[PDB]
Design a binder for this molecule. Structure first.
Ligand SMILES: *[C@@H]1O[C@H](CO)[C@@H](O)[C@H](O)[C@H]1NC(C)=O
Ligand SMILES: *[C@@H]1O[C@H](CO)[C@@H](O)[C@H](O)[C@H]1NC(C)=O
Ligand SMILES: *[C@@H]1O[C@H](CO)[C@@H](O)[C@H](O)[C@H]1NC(C)=O
Ligand SMILES: *[C@@H]1O[C@H](CO)[C@@H](O)[C@H](O)[C@H]1NC(C)=O
Ligand SMILES: *[C@@H]1O[C@H](CO)[C@@H](O)[C@H](O)[C@H]1NC(C)=O
Ligand SMILES: *[C@@H]1O[C@H](CO)[C@@H](O)[C@H](O)[C@H]1NC(C)=O
Lengths: 165, 220, 319, 214
């Protein structure tokens, strides 16, 4: 039952948030959600519903102003609706692209934040996990998750383990 | 039927500890963030603590650290607030609450959807007595009568009329703390003056703190 | 033991929703919200808007006063509902610029008719026909006065009706188009009639054309309906040497949020700000797919039946 | 931590009016703000969440338009049912602080109080206590004065009064005034009178009874 990262894997059994940690140490396995990175994405998505409607309400009038100048016959109106329906889909498509970009972006920021914490005491395994080269019990994990891990505390031990083989 | 009912409130002398319990009924209790909120009498709501959807995580308000302890038995569909080292800041009504899903997540910090009726916990080393009930029957277009609930402690008492079928025109006044240390209340209901003993009027007073049962007829 | 592993991951759903992006036409996501209302109850809510069911009558038939539409006299509405089963049962008529008169009256939201005296000297009033019977006897549009010759002369009518009130008056009048030259002379004496109505701001001159049309209710003739608005301080002048279908008075015009809709949906007791021919729809979503014709606070019509807004990160199943 | 500062603390408005409450924060919270309603005697129900979304089965009159450190819950075409206290809650992160509260009260036509007085029952007199109750039913405004008279002797200090919150149906209040005495004080005097100063005919009304008579 080895744990895997975000590279080509998602966590079905993670409902408390969008991003989180999963560990394997001397005291057994565990899991925890990361609220700061999750809450950052949520704050942006809350913004998007209003923005998607504040701008769709801008094109709808813009299009009508152009057709009002032309003035409605049925072939003229259906063209208007086809043009407005195309514009609406494009806006929503663009926001969806942005939502997927900002959610994928938040994952990388969390991975890099963790890498900076571990500094030279761990190595990137390549599947979205770090192999931390020292005894990191449950209390040691929480310090990484809440951003207080001091690598200098474990430098002598960690470097000695990497030297081994 | 999607509800959640509390229990456990009552009297406790300063310095000891209580345990409130929340009982969910009618939904996926196992998949829900649950909160606790209290209110000073006629003041405002105070958010106390939250428990994750599984028990793993727990967070408490600043003025509530140390003393309180949430916990849950998903097999039992139950939640607990376990107040310790009670103080005069604990007299209040304590409510459950369910956290709403946020974009499909069981996030720990969200708004509160469903609420319980609320058990009241009053810290005091005073008496723990049932109520005395007296009828208010006058005689003089519409006329009013009522019931006077006297000398009870602690809060609260509920008052219904005709086993709950008669509610229109009722006014149950807020209790006031008597100089004797017990509360006093009074419940009234307006009816047509022409309904003199052709209609039976019964106020049903229930005082749960002491498991008391009362039915008092008010007649001309 | 001597080392440990700390993995980073994201949440996932067993089966997510498909949305569209700039790079992908269908990319599965953990959450999305629907922005297009596509369902209707099928009934029109009588509240809060005052809905008036036309049933067998159209707005124009009620306006002119078709015998079977007399119940709509002085009737008011917020939305007038016109049924496909509606029919005409009076004198055959046409209305140049029908849409505009229908739209104009619909916006007023009332059929309040005030009768005026109008002195028609030298002509026979209250003409009728067997095509427009009212009761056992023959009749005509209640709001129109069919003038014909008196004896052997149809003089040049030259009547004036000033607007001294503080609102716009809508006058409905017409021009008779006989099917034969004998009919023309027998009714109006002169071989070629003329009807002109004018105001200080407007003028309408029309010379009737004598022509047989397809038989409607046993008649080959028609009437052309016209309308004039007279603003305060203006005056209505009617000059006619023949074929005039005189007005009996005016309709009080109002400017409001009223309109008309063509629908065959039943009306029901419920509340809905938005109304479509297909029935009422909830206005919680920004867009809608039920009908481009709407009334009240409605979502904007879109052709799509679904527009999903990504509300989550991309969903990949765990392996 | 952050600190919500709801306002106004309380207000009175007329039916059909446009009321607005404002929740302010001492630090940005995004859209993580919710609005709660607590009708008298009822448990609080949720109104707005995410700053602007409305909750199912919640009247459409309610809407929320804010973000950052400045939010606004707005009631348009205020109705009688909307009598209650409204709280804003910040759920960005712990602690999920609540506003201080806002009480919304209706402003309507003037109503005169119905006065009744109830002597103590024989069952109560038996136990050595004498409670005289004076009731003011369905009146407006809240401000009112009660005066006790025992055979014309004004007794003050041994009286307690309680007021119901405005009812949704008639937008009225009710007040109870209870005078608690021993067996000795009640049984010594005849006329126990309840004097009300408000607005009958703008003249103080008196309702009296003679002990053990009518
Ligand atoms: C982080 O977690 C550790 C537990 O290992 C705890 O000692 C420390 O106080 C935490 N710091 C913060 C800022 O929460
Ligand atoms: C669970 O509920 C049953 C019935 O109330 C009770 O006997 C038991 O002690 C409860 N305990 C837990 C831990 O759920
Ligand atoms: C998406 O998330 C919202 C958040 O509450 C939830 O109500 C909805 O059911 C979810 N829908 C899907 C398709 O996941
Ligand atoms: C319509 O209203 C006018 C207004 O004065 C009135 O004279 C007329 O009799 C009314 N007609 C009907 C049919 O109610
Ligand atoms: C018709 O009436 C107008 C009223 O101003 C008058 O000027 C005009 O001379 C009249 N026409 C005839 C032919 O008498
Ligand atoms: C809606 O109603 C119109 C009638 O005007 C009908 O032709 C159309 O097929 C209906 N479509 C839907 C989706 O309700």
């Amino acid at each position: 039952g080895a744990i895997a990262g975000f590279i080509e894997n998602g966590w079905e059994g993670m409902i408390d948030g969008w991003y989180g940690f999963r560990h394997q140490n001397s005291e057994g396995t565990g899991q925890a959600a990361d609220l700061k990175s999750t809450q950052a994405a949520i704050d942006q998505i809350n913004g998007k519903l209003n923005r998607v409607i504040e701008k769709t309400n801008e094109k709808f009038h813009q299009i009508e102003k152009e057709f009002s100048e032309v003035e409605l016959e049925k072939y003229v109106e259906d063209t208007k609706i086809d043009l407005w329906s195309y514009n609406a889909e494009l806006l929503v498509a663009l926001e969806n692209q942005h939502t997927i970009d900002l959610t994928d972006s938040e994952m990388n920021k969390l991975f890099e934040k963790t890498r900076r914490q571990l500094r030279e005491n761990a190595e990137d395994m390549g599947n979205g996990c770090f192999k931390i080269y020292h005894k990191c019990d449950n209390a040691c994990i929480e310090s990484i998750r809440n951003g207080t891990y001091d690598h200098d505390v474990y430098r002598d031990e960690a470097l000695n383990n990497r030297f081994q083989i | 039927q999607v509800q959640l009912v509390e229990s456990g409130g009552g009297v406790v002398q300063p310095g000891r500890s209580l345990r409130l319990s929340c009982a969910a009924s009618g939904f996926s209790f196992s998949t829900s963030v649950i909160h606790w909120v209290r209110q000073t009498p006629g003041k405002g709501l105070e958010w106390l603590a939250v428990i994750s959807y599984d028990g793993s995580n727990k967070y408490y308000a600043d003025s509530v650290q140390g003393r309180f302890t949430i916990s849950r038995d998903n097999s039992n569909n139950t939640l607990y607030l376990q107040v310790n080292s009670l103080r005069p800041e604990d007299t209040a009504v304590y409510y459950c609450a369910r956290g709403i899903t946020v974009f499909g997540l069981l996030i720990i910090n969200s708004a509160m959807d469903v609420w319980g009726q609320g058990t009241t916990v009053t810290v005091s080393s005073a008496s723990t007595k049932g109520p005395s009930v007296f009828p208010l029957a006058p005689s003089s277009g519409t006329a009013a009568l009522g019931c006077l609930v006297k000398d009870y402690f602690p809060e609260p008492v509920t008052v219904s009329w005709n086993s709950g079928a008669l509610t229109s025109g009722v006014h149950t006044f807020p209790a006031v703390l008597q100089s004797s240390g017990l509360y006093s209340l009074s419940s009234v209901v307006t009816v047509p003056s022409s309904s003199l003993g052709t209609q039976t009027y019964i106020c049903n007073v229930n005082h749960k703190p002491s498991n008391t049962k009362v039915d008092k007829k008010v007649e001309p | 033991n001597s080392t440990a592993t700390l993995c980073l991951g994201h949440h996932a759903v067993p089966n997510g929703t498909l949305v569209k992006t700039i790079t992908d036409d269908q990319i599965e996501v953990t959450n999305a919200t629907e922005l297009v209302q596509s369902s209707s109850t099928g009934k029109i809510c009588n509240n809060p808007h005052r809905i008036l069911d036309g049933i067998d009558c159209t707005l124009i038939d009620a306006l002119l006063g078709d015998p079977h539409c007399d119940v709509f006299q002085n009737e008011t509405w917020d939305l007038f509902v016109e049924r496909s089963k509606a029919f005409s049962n009076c004198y055959p008529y046409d209305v140049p610029d029908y849409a505009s008169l229908r739209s104009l009256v619909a916006s007023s939201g009332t059929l309040e008719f005030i009768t005026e005296g109008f002195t028609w000297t030298g002509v026979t009033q209250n003409g009728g026909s067997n095509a427009c019977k009212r009761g056992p006897g023959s009749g005509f549009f209640s709001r129109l006065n069919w003038l014909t010759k008196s004896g052997s002369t149809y003089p040049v009518l030259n009547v004036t009706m000033p607007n001294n009130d503080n609102f716009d008056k809508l006058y409905i009048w017409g021009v008779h188009h006989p099917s034969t030259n004998q009919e023309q002379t027998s009714l109006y004496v002169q071989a070629s009639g003329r009807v002109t109505v004018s105001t200080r701001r407007s003028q309408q001159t029309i010379i009737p054309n004598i022509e047989s049309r397809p038989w409607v209710r046993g008649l080959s003739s028609r009437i052309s309906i016209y309308w004039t608005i007279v603003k305060p301080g203006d005056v209505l002048v009617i000059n006619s040497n023949g074929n005039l279908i005189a007005p009996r008075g005016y309709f009080k015009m109002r400017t409001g949020k009223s309109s008309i809709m063509r629908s065959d949906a039943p009306i029901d007791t419920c509340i809905s700000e938005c109304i479509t021919p297909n029935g009422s729809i909830p206005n919680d979503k920004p867009f809608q797919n039920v009908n481009k014709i709407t009334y009240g606070a409605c979502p904007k019509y879109v052709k799509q039946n679904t527009l999903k807004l990504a509300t989550g990160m991309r969903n990949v199943p765990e392996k | 931590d952050i600190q919500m500062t709801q306002s106004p603390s309380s207000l009175s408005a007329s039916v059909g009016d446009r009321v607005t409450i404002t929740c302010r924060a001492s630090q940005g919270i995004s859209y993580n703000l919710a609005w709660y309603q607590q009708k008298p005697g009822r448990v609080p129900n949720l109104l707005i969440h995410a700053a602007s979304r409305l909750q199912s089965g919640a009247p459409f009159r309610f809407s929320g338009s804010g973000s950052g450190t400045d939010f606004t819950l707005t009631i348009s075409s205020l109705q009688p049912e909307d009598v209650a206290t409204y709280y804003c809650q910040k759920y960005d992160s712990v602690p999920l602080t609540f506003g201080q509260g806002t009480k919304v009260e209706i402003k309507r036509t003037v109503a005169a109080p119905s006065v009744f007085i109830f002597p103590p029952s024989d069952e109560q007199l038996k136990s050595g206590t004498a409670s005289v109750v004076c009731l003011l039913n369905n009146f407006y405004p809240r401000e009112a004065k009660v005066q006790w008279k025992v055979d014309n002797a004004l007794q003050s200090g041994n009286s307690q009064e309680s007021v119901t919150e405005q009812d949704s149906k008639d937008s009225t209040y009710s007040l109870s005034s209870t005078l608690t005495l021993s067996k000795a004080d009640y049984e010594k005097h005849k006329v126990y009178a309840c004097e009300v100063t408000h607005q009958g005919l703008s003249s103080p009304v008196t309702k009296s009874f003679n002990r053990g008579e009518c």
